[PDB]
RNA sequence: ACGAGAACAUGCGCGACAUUCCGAA
C-alpha cells in the first residue's frame, strides 16, 4: 500500500501526521463518508469544502501542509471528483484511514 | 473338454443365505449357480440339454488382487501342540500356488493361520429393514435383517466351467444375462448385481492337468447308488445338507420346499473319482427341480 | 461281588493317611479304622486297605486270590514327610519350562495363595470325625452305593494331599489318587478276569519281575468320545422364542453327553471313576483292554450312530476312538503318554472325517416326500411339525425351559420331555418328582446340579433369580432406565488349553493322575467358581468349560464381569494360563446366530498374536486386559464420567473430532476442550491422550463407553 | 425373446437424506468404504408405495415389484440396486473440505411443559449425489410401455415425495437424472422408452 | 421508591460556554458552543450533572437523580465573549430549562 | 389418483432470524447449509411452529402431553403416530434455502448474510451486566420455501388449505425460532405459485394467503 | 387464541445511544435501530421496580406474577410463555426523509470532558422516530385488561425514564405515540383498550 | 504445529496472560473481517478478494497501533506477513491454509487460557 | 427352476424457554 510508504517516510512523524492536528481533517472526511454511507451534488460540494479546508489547515499549520503535500490527499480528492463514483470515494476514504492507521502504528 | 475361468466382480452387496435371511455367506455352491443358469436358460427360451448333460462347474471360490483361492483339502495332517490342529481347522481357503505345498504337509500351523488371515475377500454385514405393508391396514412396521457381503474392490468370486464348445458358448450367453439377472437371495431388492468375465485360464489349466494319487472335490457333489460302492471306501469328506424352497412361477400355487439333499462338500478327498448326477429333488410338482451334484475333480499328491 | 470289593478297597486304600495325619503305618491305621465299621468290614476292602504296599504284601499270608495285589499294583501305577503339609497347586508345575515353578498352595472353592501354610492336626481330627460320622450311618456298601461313596470322597478329600513326601510336589490330591487307583484297579480286574487268572500273586507280584512285565503289558484303553454339532444346535436357532431356549439347548446337550457316558460305563460294569474327563462334548475314559470292552465299545458306537441318525439326522453326531495303553504309558516312564493322547485325538479326528457309511448316505437321499411345513427354531421339515410350527424337539426344550428355573433335578426316565438314546427321555423335575420317577420304574437316572449323580455345570441366570423378570429371560437384561439397551455377548476361550495338557506339564511330571487333577481343577473352576464370580450381574451363562465359554447379559455387566473373570482366572491358575475373550454388543431381536458369529470372529481377532487380548466391540478395539481395565476405564472413563456428571452432545463432538486425524481437527479439539467448562488439568490430559497414538484409541473407547452409559 | 433394459443415472440430494463410532441416529453406510448409500429396498418400497397410492394389490404393482401370493407368483420386473455415493460428488466434497454427512440438531417442545428435548440425526449433505442402477425385465412385450409409464409416474411422485427418514419435516428431497436407458439383454427397442 | 419530577430553570447571569471541541479561525468566519444534531444550541445534561457532582464533592443518592439534556436555546442568545481568547457564550438573561427526576425519597 | 400440489415461494426475514444449529465467541451460531455455508431455515422448524400455532388456535386438550393428542384437523395435516391410528402427513414442508436473488443483493452492498447481535443481562440484585453475542440472519434475506400437499381426500382439501392459510397467518404474526419475544424471527410469506404438479386436481381456487 | 398488534412510533426526545462508542445500526440499511430486546428488558425492569421485589431477587424467574405472565418465564417446571413479542424498532422512513431533506446526519457525536479526559459518544439525533411493533398473545381472556394496565404503566415509566446508554447524564429520553391497537389475528375485541 | 509453539512461547503467568493481555474481544473485528473474506472465497482469488485482504492488512496495522496486545500477537504470529504471502501467491488453497493457521492460532490461544 | 419369493428402519418432533450493551465521570 502506498499509504504505509509515505507514512514511514514522514516518520522521523509530523504534527500533521499526529491525530491531534489531523483531527479536523478526519472529522471532515467522516462527515462526507457518513453522507455517502447513508447514500451526489452535495458530495461534490463537501469535497470542494474539503479541499478548501485542506488549504485552511495548511495555512494554520505547516506540518499539516507537509502531510497534505506528501500524501497527495487534495490531488486524490480532485481525482475522485473527476471519477465521480461512490466506489472511488470509498477507496479514497480507505486510503486516508490507512494513512491515519499507519501513522498511529508507527507512533 | 474346454475349461473356462469365469470371474464375477460384484457391484452391490450380495446376499448368500445358508438357512436364514440374516445369514451372510460369502460364496455359493455349484447347485445354486446351476439353478441360476437353468432359470436363465428358461427365461431366454434356450435348450437345457447342454446344461443338464455336458456342463461341469465348480463352487464359487474367493479371489483377491493377489491370488485365486481353492477349498481346503480334507486330508490328514501329521502336525506337541494340539492348538495347531485348531488353527488348521479354522482355515478354509488356500491359494492355488500353495495348494501342492499344503497337500505335502509343508504348511505349518502358524503358516496356516497366516494363510487364513491373508484372505482379502470382503466384509459381511447385516442390513436391518422394515415392512410397512401392515401400517396402511391399521398395523405396524415389521423389521427384518438381511445378511449381505460386500467384496473388496480387487476381490470377487470365480468358478471353472468345463464343457464342449456349444456348452461354453451357451454358458457365455447365460452369464451375460446373469450379470443383470443377479445371484443371491435379494436380487429383486438390490443385492447380487455383478459383472462376469469368461476367459481361458492357463494357470488353472496347468493346475487341472496335474495327476496324483488323491482326488479333491471342487464342487458340491454326490455319487449315484451304483458309484457309491467303491468311491466311499477310504475317503475324508463332509456331508452338507442342501435344502431350499422352489423358485419358479409354475411349480405350484404356493411356495414349497424341495426334498432335502445331502452332498459331499467341496474340498472332500476321495481315492476313487465318481461322476455326479443332476438329482431331481422335485416332489409332485408341475416341473422337475434339478440339483447339480456333478463332481469337478482336482488330482493331487498327498 | 469281588469287583465291588476291589472298587471299595481301591477307593479307600489310603483312608488311613488322614487318620495318621490326625495323630503304625497308614495302611494298618486305615485297616483298623475301616474295621471300626461293620458294613466296610468286608474281606476285600480291608485287605486292599491293609496290604496295598510291598512291605505288608510280602508277609500278608493271603490266598493269592485277594484283590489286595490288584489294589497294590493300581496304587503303584497311579502314584508312579511333612505330616502338616498343604496341597500344592497343580499349576505350579504346568508351563514351568517358560514361566517358572511357583509355590502356590491350598489352605485347609479355594484359591491358591502362595503363602506358607500348614494343615493343623485339629483340622485332620475334625475330618476324621466327619468321615466316621458319614461312614457310620449315611454310607453303605452295595452296587448302587459306590456312586454315593465316590461323591462323598470327592466332597471330603478334594483338598487333602495324596502324599506328604517333601521331595516330590504335592499337586495330586487324595481324591484324585484314590479315583485313579480305583479306575486302574477296575481295569486290571477286568483284564485278569478276561485272561482267567486265578493266582494274582503268581501273575504279577510273586517274582517281583512279573510286576514290571505287567507294567509292560498292554492292559488299558484310552477312549475319547466326541459329540459334534453342539454349537450349531445351540446357536443356529431363529425366532422370538430362541433366547429362552438358548440355555435349555445347551443343558440338553450336556445331559445327553452325561447320559451317553453313564450308558457306556454301565455296559462295562464300571463306575464314574473310570471317567477321566467330561467337557464340551468330549469325554475321556480309561477302560480295560479286553475283548469284551472292545465289543462293548463297537456296539455302543453303532447304537449311538443309529440313534443320532434317527433323531437328529446329520445335525448331531458322536464318535468314539480308543487306543491301547500300557502301565508304563500311564506312568510315563517311557514318555509315550502325550503320544498316546495325541494318537487318540488323531484317531478321533479320522473317525470324524468319514462320519457316515454307504447305507446311511443312501438313506439320507431317500427323502420320500417333500418337507412342506417346517418348525421355527429348527429349519427341519423331515421331523413331524406340530401346530404353531414347533418341531418335536424345541417343543419339550421349551418345556425344559420354565422348569429348569423351577426345578433342580434332571431325570432320565422312560417317560419325559426331550428324547435320549436307548429310548429314554430327559425331564426337569424337583425332589418329589424325581423320587416318584425312581419309585415307578427302575433304570431311571437322577442328576443333581452342583449339589443320584452330581453334575458340575454353570447354570447362572439372573432372570430366574427375580420372579417378576423370570418370564422375560435374557431380554429382561435390556430393561434399563439409564444406558443404551443392548445385550453383551462374551465368547471366551483358553489359549493352548490342549497344548497345556500335552506339554504344559513337563515330562518329569506328566502322568495320568496329573492329567486327571488338572482336568478336574479346570472343570471345577468353569462349572462351580464361575457362578460365584458372576454373582449379582445381569448375565445368563449359556455355555461353560473354558474350552468354549459363552455368556449373554447386559453389555456393561458383561464387560465388568469379563474383567473380574480375567482377574479370577489369573488367580486360579496362578498365572501360566492366558485368557482371550471377544465381547460383542447387539440389540434385542438381533439373530442369536448372528450374535454368536460376530462374537466368534471378535474372539478369533483377540486370539491372534498376543493371545491375551479382548475384542471389545469391533476390529479396532483389540486391547489388553490390563489396558482395558486400567487405561480405558480407570484412567480415562472414570475422570470423564466424574467431570461430566450429562454432556452427551459434547462427547459426540469429541468423537467426531477424534475420528479425523487432521491437525485442523487437533486445533478444533483444543478449542472444544477450552470451551468445555471442565477442569483445565483434565483438558490437558485429554489433549495429551489425543496427541499420542495408542492413547487416542483408549480415549475414544472411554468416550464411547461413557456415551453408551449415558444413553436413554 | 427375453430382454433386460438397464437404466443408469444419478439421485441428487436436494435436502438432507436420512436412511436408518458412536453416532446418534446414523445413516446407512457401505460396510467397507463407510460411504452413505441408498438401499435398493428403500427405493423399491417408496416407488411401490407411490404407485399403489396412484393406482389405488393391483396387477400392475405385483407385475412390476413382484408377488408371492398363492396362485399369483409373479417375478419382479424391477430390480433396483443400492445407490452408491458417486465419485464425482466424493471428489467435490473432498475439495472445500466438506464432510459427506451432517448432524442435524432438532428438538421437541412438549405440549405440557414446553421443555425442548434435544435430538440429533445424521443426514447426507445437500451437495451429494448417488449412482442409481435399475433393471427392467421384459417378460411381456405388449405391457412394457405401460409399465414404463407407471415407472415414470412413480419417479414423478418420487420427485415430489421424499426417500426416507423425515420428509414431512424437510428431509430426503431428491431429484432423478436419467443418464441412459439401454437394452442390455435381448433386442427390444428401448430408444423411445423414457422416464420424467 | 417514589419518583419526583422537577422543572429546573437555570438563569444566565454570566456568560456560560460549553466546549463542543470545535474551534473556527478568522478565515471560517473562536470556540464554538455545543449544538445538537438539529443545530440548536443547548446545555448538555452531563455537564450540569458533573458540576453538581463536583459541588457535592453521596454516591448512591446522586446516581438516583437523572438530569436530562436541556431544551433547545434560542439562536439569538449566542454571542462572542473575550476572556486573547474568544468563545461562544450564552447571553445574560437567558433561561435554560431542563427536567430532573429523582427516585430517592429522602 | 394420487394428486400432489406444490406451493413455492419466498420467506422474507423482517427482523433478524436466529435458528440455532450445532457447529467465534458468540453464545450460539445459526443453522447453515453445509454445502454452501449459507444460513438456512429447516423445514422442521417451519412445520413445528405452524403445528404449534394451529394447536394453540384450535385449542389444546386440557392436560395434553403428546403431539398426537391434537385436533383431528392437525393430525390430518401434519400427521399422527398413534398405535392403530397413524395418519399420513399431508403437509411436507422442506428446508428453506437462502435464495440466489438475496445472495446477489447481499454480495452487492458487501454484506455477510449474518450479524452478531450484542445483548446483556442485568442482574436484578447487583445490576452487573453479563454480555452475550448471538448470530442472526440479516433482515434483507429471503428463503425459497417449498411445500407439498398430498390429496388423500378430495373433500377435505379446501378445509386443509384454509387451515394452512390460518397457520401461515399465525406464523407471520408470530416469529420463527430463536428469542422471537425480543425482536427475532419476524418473517413474511410471499407465495409465488400454487400448482397441482401430480394428478388432475384443480388447485386454481386454492390459496394459503 | 388471538394476537393483538400494537404499532406506533418511538420519538427520540434526547440523544439515544445503544452500544454494539457507536450506536447499534441495522446491517441491511446501515441505519440506527432500537432492538426489541432492549425495549423489552427496559420495560420489564421498570415494571418490576414498580411492583415490589423480594429482598433476595437474584433471577428474572422470581419476579412478580404479572412480570412472568407478560414477559415469560424459564422457571424449571413453571415455564410461562411470553404474551409480549417486542420487535426491533427500525428507523422511520418519514423521519429518514425528514433528515434527508436537509444536510443532516442521522447520528450525532457528543463530547464529555470527564474532568480532563475527553470521551466521545455517538447518539441518535434528537427528533428521530422509530416505529415499533408489539404482539400481545391472548391466552387468557380475563387477564387481558390487567396485562394492558401493566403495559400502560410500564410505557409511562419508560417515558419517565430513559432507554439505553447513560440516561442519568441526560441522554436517551424517548416518547411513545400509539397508532393502533387492533387484534390482527382472531376474534378478540381490542377496541376498548 | 507452528501456531502451538508461537502461542506457548509467549504464555506467561501474572492468571495466565497471552501476548501481554490478549483477549478474543480485541480479535473480534479481525476475526469478523477474516470470516467475511473466507465466506467470499468459499462462495466463489478475485480482485475484490485482494482488496479485502489489503483492507485486512490495513486493519491489522490499525489494531496493532490501537492495542499493544494485538501488536504483540501480530508481530509474534506473522499474520500480516502471511497475508502478504497469500496476496503474492494468489491461490485460494493458500488462503484456506492461512485461514486454518489463524483458526489454529485462536484455538490454541483459548486452549492455554 | 438361486434358504428362496413379497417387505420404505418407516411413522409424531420448533434447537427451543427467561436475558437492557449496561452503572461512573
- Range of the structural domain that residue B150 is part of: 2-65+120-209
Radius of gyration (Cα) for chain H, nearest Å? Answer: 14
HEC assignment per residue over C9-25: HHHCCCHHHHHHHHCCC
Domain containing B186 — which CATH number? Answer: 3.30.70
Q: Do B143 and B202 lie in a common domain?
A: yes
Q: Do C500 and C411 lie in a common domain?
A: no
User: Is E45 part of the contact surface with chain G (CB cutoff 8 Å)?
Assistant: yes
In a domain, C91, yes or no: no
Tell me which chains share at least 3 CB pairs under 8 Å with chain B.
C, D, F
Shortest CA gap H88–chain F (Å): 24
Q: CA D130, CA D82: separation in Å to the nearest integer?
A: 9
Q: CA F168, CA F162: separation in Å to the nearest integer?
A: 10
Name the E strands within C81-186: 87-88, 105-106
CB C444 within 8 A of CB C412: yes
Q: How was this structure determined?
A: cryo-EM
HEC assignment per residue over chain H: CHHHHHHHCCEEECCEEECCCCCCCCCHHHHHHHHHHHHHHHHCCCHHHHHHHHHHHHHHHHHHHHCHHHHHHHHHHCHHHHHHHHHHHCCHHHHHHHHHHHHHHHHHHHHCC
In a domain, C54, yes or no: yes
Residues of F in contact with G1 (CB under 8 A): 56-57, 59
Q: CA C120, CA C64: separation in Å to the nearest integer?
A: 40
Nucleotide nearest to F43 (CA to C1'): I14
For residue F189 the three cell numbers come to 410469506
Place of cell 427526576: E101
Q: Best interface-test mutation with G: which of D107, D112, D114 has the largest number of G CBs within 10 A?
A: D114
Contact call for C and D: 3+ CB–CB distances under 8 Å:
yes
Four-residue CA torsion sign, H15, H17, H20, H22: negative
HEC assignment per residue over E24-88: CCCCCCCEEECECCCCCECCCHHHHHHHHHHHHCCCHHHHHCEECCCCCCCHHHEEEEECCCEEE
For residue F7 the three cell numbers come to 406451493
The Cβ of residue C608 has, within 10 Å, a number of other Cβ atoms equal to 15
Q: Do C195 and C227 lie in a common domain?
A: no
User: Is D56 part of the contact surface with chain B (CB cutoff 8 Å)?
Assistant: no
Q: Do B201 and B218 lie in a common domain?
A: no
The Cβ of residue F163 has, within 10 Å, a number of other Cβ atoms equal to 23
CB B66 within 8 A of CB B163: no
Q: CA B157, CA B196: separation in Å to the nearest integer?
A: 9
For residue D137 the three cell numbers come to 425385465
Question: What percentage of chain C's residues is helix, strand, coil (to nearest 5)?
Answer: 50, 15, 35
Q: Do B281 and B229 lie in a common domain?
A: yes
Place of cell 444534531: E37
Query: Across the interface, which of F43, F52, F64 has its CB nearest the CB of D170?
Result: F43
Give chain A's largest Cα–Cα span. Answer: 40
Q: CA F206, CA G84: separation in Å to the nearest integer?
A: 33
Number of structural domains chain C divides into: 4
Nucleotide nearest to G63 (CA to C1'): I18
Residues 6+ away with beta carbon under 8 Å from C546: C279, C493, C494, C497, C522, C525, C526
Q: CA B191, CA D82: separation in Å to the nearest integer?
A: 7
For residue B188 the three cell numbers come to 429383486
Q: At what angle do helices C43-50 and C68-79 cross, to 10 degrees?
A: 40
Q: CA D168, CA H33: separation in Å to the nearest integer?
A: 39
Residues of H in contact with A104 (CB under 8 A): 62, 65-66
Q: Do C422 and C531 lie in a common domain?
A: no
CB D52 within 8 A of CB D61: yes
Q: Do C608 and C675 lie in a common domain?
A: no
Chain I: positions less than 7 Å from a protein CB are: 1-25
Nearest residue in chain F measured CA to CA from B141: F83
CB B244 within 8 A of CB B202: no
Q: Do C276 and C380 lie in a common domain?
A: yes
Q: CA C526, CA C280: separation in Å to the nearest integer?
A: 11
Q: Do C148 and C288 lie in a common domain?
A: no
Nearest residue in chain B measured CA to CA from C376: B20
Tell me B251's DSSP state.
S
Query: Across the interface, which of C648, C649, C700 has its CB nearest the CB of D21?
Result: C700
Residues 6+ away with beta carbon under 8 Å from B62: B26, B27, B68, B69, B93, B119, B121, B155, B156, B157
Number of structural domains chain E divides into: 1
Three-class DSSP category at G171: coil
In a domain, C99, yes or no: no
Contact call for B and H: 3+ CB–CB distances under 8 Å:
no
Q: Do B56 and B151 lie in a common domain?
A: yes
Q: Do C274 and C390 lie in a common domain?
A: yes
User: Which residue minimizes Cα–C1' distance to I11?
Assistant: F81
Residues 6+ away with beta carbon under 8 Å from H14: none
Q: Best interface-test mutation with C: which of B83, B147, B232 has the largest number of C CBs within 10 A?
A: B83
In whole angstroms, I18 C1' to C371 CA is 70
Place of cell 448372528: C594
Which residues sit opposite D175 in a β-bridge?
D12
Radius of gyration (Cα) for chain B, nearest Å? Answer: 20
HEC assignment per residue over chain A: CHHHHHHHHHCCCCCCCCHHHHHHHHHHHHHHHHHHHHCCHHHHHHHHHHHHHHHHHHHHCHHHHHHHHHHCHHHHHHHHHHHCCHHHHHHHHHHHHHHHHHHHHHC
Query: Across the interface, which of F117, F121, F124 has its CB nearest the CB of G57?
Result: F124
In a domain, C163, yes or no: yes
Q: CA A79, CA A92: separation in Å to the nearest integer?
A: 9
User: Is E101 part of the contact surface with chain G (CB cutoff 8 Å)?
Assistant: yes
Closest alpha carbon to C500 in C510, C508, C486: C510
Q: CA C273, CA C182: separation in Å to the nearest integer?
A: 7
Q: CA G93, CA G130: separation in Å to the nearest integer?
A: 9
Q: CA C523, CA C517: separation in Å to the nearest integer?
A: 10
In a domain, B102, yes or no: no
Which residues sit opposite D169 in a β-bridge?
none
| Alpha helices, DSSP H, located in C313-442 | 327-331, 337-353, 358-364, 397-400, 431-440
| Alpha helices, DSSP H, located in chain G | 36-50, 65-71, 93-101, 144-160
- Range of the structural domain that residue E47 is part of: 4-102
Four-residue CA torsion sign, F173, F177, F182, F188: negative
Closest alpha carbon to D4 in D193, D195, D196: D193
Which residues sit opposite F91 in a β-bridge?
F149
Residues of G in contact with D115 (CB under 8 A): 79
Q: CA C310, CA C360: separation in Å to the nearest integer?
A: 10
The Cβ of residue H53 has, within 10 Å, a number of other Cβ atoms equal to 22
CA geometry: angle C264, C190, C213, nearest 5 deg: 130
Q: Best interface-test mutation with F: which of H27, H34, H43, H106 has the largest number of F CBs within 10 A?
A: H43
CA C186 to chain centre: 25
Number of structural domains chain B divides into: 2
Closest alpha carbon to C200 in C216, C182, C188, C212: C188
**Domain boundary residue among C406, C434, C455?**
C455
User: Is E28 part of the contact surface with chain A (CB cutoff 8 Å)?
Assistant: yes
Residues of F in contact with D109 (CB under 8 A): 48, 52
Cβ–Cβ gap H104/C673 under 8 Å: no
Closest alpha carbon to B18 in B129, B147, B124: B147
Q: CA B220, CA B33: separation in Å to the nearest integer?
A: 11
Q: Do B43 and B126 lie in a common domain?
A: yes
Q: CA A15, CA D109: separation in Å to the nearest integer?
A: 64
Residues 6+ away with beta carbon under 8 Å from A85: none
Nucleotide nearest to F44 (CA to C1'): I14
Number of structural domains chain A divides into: 1
Residues of G in contact with A42 (CB under 8 A): 103
Amino acid at each position: 500500500n502506498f499509504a504505509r510508504k509515505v507514512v514511514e517516510e514522514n516518520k522521523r512523524l509530523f504534527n500533521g501526521l499526529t491525530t491531534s492536528k489531523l483531527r479536523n481533517l478526519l472529522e471532515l472526511i467522516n462527515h462526507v463518508y457518513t453522507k455517502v454511507y447513508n447514500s451526489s451534488e452535495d458530495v461534490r460540494d463537501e469535497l470542494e469544502y474539503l479541499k478548501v479546508k485542506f488549504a485552511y489547515e495548511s495555512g494554520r499549520e505547516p506540518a499539516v501542509r507537509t502531510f497534505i503535500e506528501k500524501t497527495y490527499v487534495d490531488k486524490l480528492v480532485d481525482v475522485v471528483l473527476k471519477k465521480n463514483t461512490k466506489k472511488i470515494f470509498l477507496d479514497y476514504c480507505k486510503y486516508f484511514e490507512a494513512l491515519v492507521a499507519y501513522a498511529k502504528f508507527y507512533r | 473338454l474346454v475349461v473356462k475361468l469365469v470371474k464375477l466382480t460384484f457391484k452391490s452387496p450380495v446376499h448368500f443365505g445358508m438357512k436364514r435371511l440374516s445369514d451372510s455367506n460369502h460364496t455359493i455352491a455349484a447347485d445354486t449357480l446351476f439353478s441360476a443358469l437353468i432359470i436363465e436358460a428358461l427365461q431366454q427360451q434356450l435348450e437345457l440339454s447342454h446344461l443338464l448333460n455336458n456342463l461341469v462347474i465348480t463352487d464359487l471360490f474367493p479371489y483377491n488382487k493377489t491370488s485365486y483361492f481353492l477349498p481346503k483339502p480334507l486330508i490328514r495332517i501329521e502336525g506337541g501342540d494340539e492348538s495347531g490342529y485348531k488353527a488348521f481347522k479354522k482355515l478354509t481357503y488356500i491359494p492355488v500356488e500353495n495348494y501342492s505345498e499344503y497337500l505335502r504337509g509343508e504348511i505349518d500351523s502358524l503358516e496356516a493361520s497366516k494363510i487364513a488371515e491373508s484372505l482379502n475377500l470382503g466384509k459381511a454385514s447385516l442390513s436391518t429393514k422394515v415392512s410397512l405393508q401392515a401400517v396402511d391396514h391399521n398395523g405396524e412396521s415389521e423389521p427384518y435383517s438381511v445378511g449381505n457381503f460386500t467384496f473388496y474392490p480387487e476381490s470377487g468370486l470365480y468358478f471353472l466351467a468345463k464343457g464342449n464348445a456349444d456348452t461354453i458358448g451357451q454358458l457365455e450367453i447365460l452369464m451375460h444375462a446373469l450379470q443383470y439377472s443377479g445371484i443371491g437371495g435379494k436380487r429383486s431388492a438390490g443385492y447380487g448385481q455383478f459383472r462376469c468375465t469368461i476367459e481361458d485360464s492357463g494357470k488353472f489349466d496347468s493346475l487341472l492337468s496335474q495327476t496324483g494319487n488323491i482326488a479333491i472335490l471342487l464342487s458340491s457333489a454326490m455319487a449315484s447308488d451304483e458309484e457309491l460302492v467303491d468311491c466311499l471306501e477310504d475317503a475324508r469328506y463332509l456331508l452338507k445338507k442342501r435344502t431350499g424352497f422352489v423358485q419358479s412361477k409354475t411349480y405350484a400355487d404356493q411356495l414349497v420346499k424341495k426334498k432335502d439333499f445331502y452332498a459331499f462338500s467341496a474340498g472332500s478327498t476321495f481315492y476313487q473319482k465318481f461322476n455326479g448326477k443332476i438329482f431331481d429333488v422335485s416332489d409332485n410338482g408341475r416341473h422337475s427341480v434339478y440339483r447339480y451334484a456333478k463332481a469337478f475333480w482336482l488330482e493331487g499328491k498327498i | 461281588n469281588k469287583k465291588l470289593e476291589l472298587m471299595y478297597g481301591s477307593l479307600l486304600h489310603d483312608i488311613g493317611k488322614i487318620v495318621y495325619r490326625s495323630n503304625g503305618t497308614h495302611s494298618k491305621i486305615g485297616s483298623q479304622f475301616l474295621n471300626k465299621f461293620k458294613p466296610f468290614q468286608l474281606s476285600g476292602i480291608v485287605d486292599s486297605v491293609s496290604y496295598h504296599h510291598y512291605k505288608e504284601l510280602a508277609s500278608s499270608s493271603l490266598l493269592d486270590d485277594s484283590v489286595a495285589y490288584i489294589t497294590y499294583i493300581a496304587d503303584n501305577i497311579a502314584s508312579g514327610f511333612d505330616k502338616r503339609a498343604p496341597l500344592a497347586s497343580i499349576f505350579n508345575v504346568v508351563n514351568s519350562e517358560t514361566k517358572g515353578l511357583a509355590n502356590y498352595t491350598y489352605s485347609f472353592y479355594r484359591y491358591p495363595t502362595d503363602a506358607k501354610k500348614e494343615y493343623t492336626s485339629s483340622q485332620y481330627a475334625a475330618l476324621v470325625n466327619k468321615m466316621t460320622d458319614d461312614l457310620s450311618n449315611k454310607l453303605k456298601v452295595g452296587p448302587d452305593s459306590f456312586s454315593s461313596l465316590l461323591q462323598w470322597t470327592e466332597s471330603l478329600w478334594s483338598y487333602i494331599p495324596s502324599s506328604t513326601d517333601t521331595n516330590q510336589v504335592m499337586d495330586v490330591s487324595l481324591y484324585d489318587h484314590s479315583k485313579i487307583t480305583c479306575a486302574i484297579a477296575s481295569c486290571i480286574y477286568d483284564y485278569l478276569t478276561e485272561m482267567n487268572c486265578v493266582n494274582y500273586r503268581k501273575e504279577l507280584f510273586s517274582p517281583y519281575e512279573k510286576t514290571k512285565q505287567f507294567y509292560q503289558e498292554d492292559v488299558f484303553l484310552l477312549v475319547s468320545l466326541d459329540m459334534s454339532g453342539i454349537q450349531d444346535f445351540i446357536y443356529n436357532i431363529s425366532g422370538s422364542k430362541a433366547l429362552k431356549s438358548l440355555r435349555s439347548r445347551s443343558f440338553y446337550l450336556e445331559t445327553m453327553l452325561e447320559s451317553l457316558v453313564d450308558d457306556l460305563l454301565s455296559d462295562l460294569e464300571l463306575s464314574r471313576a473310570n471317567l477321566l474327563y467330561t467337557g464340551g462334548g468330549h469325554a475321556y475314559l480309561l477302560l480295560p483292554n479286553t475283548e469284551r470292552a472292545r465289543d462293548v465299545l463297537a456296539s455302543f458306537e453303532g447304537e449311538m450312530k443309529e440313534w443320532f441318525i434317527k433323531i437328529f439326522k446329520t445335525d448331531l453326531s458322536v464318535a468314539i476312538a480308543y487306543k491301547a495303553c500300557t502301565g508304563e504309558d500311564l506312568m510315563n516312564s517311557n514318555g509315550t503318554y502325550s503320544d498316546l493322547w495325541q494318537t487318540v485325538s488323531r484317531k478321533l479326528s479320522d473317525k470324524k472325517a468319514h462320519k457316515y457309511s454307504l447305507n446311511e448316505i443312501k438313506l439320507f437321499n431317500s427323502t420320500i416326500h417333500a418337507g412342506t411345513q417346517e418348525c421355527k427354531e429348527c429349519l427341519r421339515s423331515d421331523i413331524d411339525i406340530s401346530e404353531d410350527s414347533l418341531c418335536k424337539i424345541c417343543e419339550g426344550i421349551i418345556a425344559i425351559s420354565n422348569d429348569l428355573r423351577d426345578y433342580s433335578f434332571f431325570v432320565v426316565s422312560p417317560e419325559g420331555k426331550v428324547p435320549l438314546p436307548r429310548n429314554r427321555y430327559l425331564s426337569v423335575e424337583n425332589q418329589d418328582g424325581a423320587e416318584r420317577k425312581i419309585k415307578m420304574n427302575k433304570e431311571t437316572r437322577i442328576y443333581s446340579k452342583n449339589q443320584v449323580t452330581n453334575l458340575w455345570m454353570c447354570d447362572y441366570d439372573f432372570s430366574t433369580l427375580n420372579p417378576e423378570t423370570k418370564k422375560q429371560g435374557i431380554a429382561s437384561y435390556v430393561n434399563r432406565e439409564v444406558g443404551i439397551p443392548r445385550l453383551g455377548v462374551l465368547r471366551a476361550d483358553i489359549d493352548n488349553l490342549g497344548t497345556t495338557f500335552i506339554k504344559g506339564i513337563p515330562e518329569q511330571y506328566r502322568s495320568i493322575s496329573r492329567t486327571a487333577t488338572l482336568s478336574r481343577q479346570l472343570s471345577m473352576f468353569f462349572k462351580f467358581e464361575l457362578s460365584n464370580i458372576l454373582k449379582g450381574a445381569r448375565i445368563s451363562v449359556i455355555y461353560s468349560g473354558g474350552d468354549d465359554l459363552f455368556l449373554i447379559g447386559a453389555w456393561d455387566d458383561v464387560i465388568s464381569k469379563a474383567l473380574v473373570l480375567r482377574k479370577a482366572f489369573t488367580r486360579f491358575s496362578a498365572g501360566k494360563l492366558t485368557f482371550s475373550a471377544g465381547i460383542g454388543m447387539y440389540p434385542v431381536k438381533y439373530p442369536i446366530s448372528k450374535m454368536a458369529s460376530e462374537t466368534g470372529v471378535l474372539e478369533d481377532l483377540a486370539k491372534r498374536g498376543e493371545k491375551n487380548q479382548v475384542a471389545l466391540w469391533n476390529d479396532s478395539k483389540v486391547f489388553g486386559w490390563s489396558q482395558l481395565e486400567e487405561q480405558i476405564l480407570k484412567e480415562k472413563m472414570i475422570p470423564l464420567q466424574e467431570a461430566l456428571t450429562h454432556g452427551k452432545s459434547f462427547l459426540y463432538k469429541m468423537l467426531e473430532l477424534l475420528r479425523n486425524e487432521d491437525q485442523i481437527n487437533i486445533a478444533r479439539l483444543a478449542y472444544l476442550l477450552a470451551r468445555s467448562s471442565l477442569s483445565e488439568e483434565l483438558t490437558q490430559s485429554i489433549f495429551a491422550w489425543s496427541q499420542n497414538k495408542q492413547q487416542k484409541v483408549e480415549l475414544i473407547t472411554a468416550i464411547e463407553y461413557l456415551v453408551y452409559q449415558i444413553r436413554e | 425373446m427375453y430382454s433386460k433394459i438397464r437404466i443408469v443415472g444419478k439421485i441428487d440430494v436436494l435436502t438432507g437424506l436420512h436412511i436408518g463410532g458412536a453416532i446418534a441416529s446414523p445413516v446407512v453406510r457401505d460396510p467397507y468404504s463407510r460411504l452413505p448409500i441408498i438401499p435398493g429396498s428403500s427405493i423399491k418400497g417408496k416407488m411401490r408405495s407411490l404407485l399403489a397410492k396412484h393406482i389405488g394389490d393391483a396387477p400392475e404393482i405385483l407385475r412390476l415389484f413382484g408377488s408371492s401370493q398363492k396362485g399369483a407368483i409373479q417375478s419382479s420386473r424391477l430390480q433396483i440396486s443400492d445407490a452408491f455415493f458417486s465419485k464425482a460428488s466424493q471428489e467435490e466434497f473432498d475439495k472445500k473440505d466438506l464432510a459427506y454427512t451432517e448432524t442435524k440438531f432438532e428438538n421437541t417442545i412438549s405440549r405440557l411443559t414446553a421443555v425442548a428435548n434435544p435430538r440429533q440425526i445424521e443426514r447426507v449433505t445437500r451437495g451429494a449425489s448417488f449412482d442409481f442402477h435399475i433393471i427392467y425385465n421384459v417378460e411381456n412385450i405388449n405391457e412394457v410401455m405401460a409399465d414404463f409409464e407407471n415407472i415414470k409416474t412413480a419417479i414423478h411422485l418420487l420427485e415430489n415425495d421424499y426417500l426416507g427418514g423425515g420428509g414431512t419435516r424437510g428431509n430426503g428431497r431428491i431429484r432423478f437424472v436419467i443418464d441412459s436407458i439401454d437394452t442390455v439383454v435381448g433386442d427390444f427397442d428401448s430408444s423411445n422408452l423414457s422416464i420424467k | 421508591m417514589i419518583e419526583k419530577v422537577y422543572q429546573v430553570k437555570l438563569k444566565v447571569y454570566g456568560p456560560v460556554h460549553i466546549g463542543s471541541g470545535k474551534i473556527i479561525r478568522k478565515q471560517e468566519y473562536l470556540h464554538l458552543f455545543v449544538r445538537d444534531g438539529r443545530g440548536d444550541l443547548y446545555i448538555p445534561g452531563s455537564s450540569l450533572k458533573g458540576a453538581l457532582r463536583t459541588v457535592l464533592e453521596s454516591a448512591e443518592a446522586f446516581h438516583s437523580l437523572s438530569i436530562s439534556d436541556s431544551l433547545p436555546i434560542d439562536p439569538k442568545n449566542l454571542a462572542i465573549y473575550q476572556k486573547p481568547l474568544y468563545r461562544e457564550c450564552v447571553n445574560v438573561g437567558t433561561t435554560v430549562e431542563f427536567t430532573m427526576k429523582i427516585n430517592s425519597d429522602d
